[PDB]
Amino acid sequence: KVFGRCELAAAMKRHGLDNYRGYSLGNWVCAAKFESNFNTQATNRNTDGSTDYGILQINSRWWCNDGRTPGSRNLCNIPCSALLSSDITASVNCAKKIVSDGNGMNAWVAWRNRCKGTDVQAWIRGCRL
Ligand SMILES: [K+]
Numbered sequence: 001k002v003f004g005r006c007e008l009a010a011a012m013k014r015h016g017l018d019n020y021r022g023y024s025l026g027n028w029v030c031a032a033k034f035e036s037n038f039n040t041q042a043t044n045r046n047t048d049g050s051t052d053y054g055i056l057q058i059n060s061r062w063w064c065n066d067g068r069t070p071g072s073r074n075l076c077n078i079p080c081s082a083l084l085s086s087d088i089t090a091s092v093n094c095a096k097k098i099v100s101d102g103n104g105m106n107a108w109v110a111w112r113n114r115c116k117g118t119d120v121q122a123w124i125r126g127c128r129l
């Protein structure tokens, strides 16, 4: 599913991400924008053999099981395919574990390089929330 901007903002807020670990809703929408362009079916293969899945491009080395990342863990206790669903619950609940791991939203390199320190509120401006 390709979410609209405000549509994704509303779904993220419903699932608890607004100010989660202190990160305002706009940070999460900005991160989803540059990780997946709001596409739940986004995937990206990495040189280490792991794959990034879904609207927040969550990585199989630590967070989900895809059966093809040797040595990896599954800390969110989900198949990576669950991160591709039109329903973002699994992605959001796993993202919460990720952002709680110690480095905050720096776990998303796209957030660090393209969202951090910017006017991220702009990503939810105009939205009925
Ligand atoms: K594996």
Ligand SMILES: [K+]
Residues within 6 Å of the ligand: 021, 022, 103, 104, 105
């Ligand atoms: K933090």
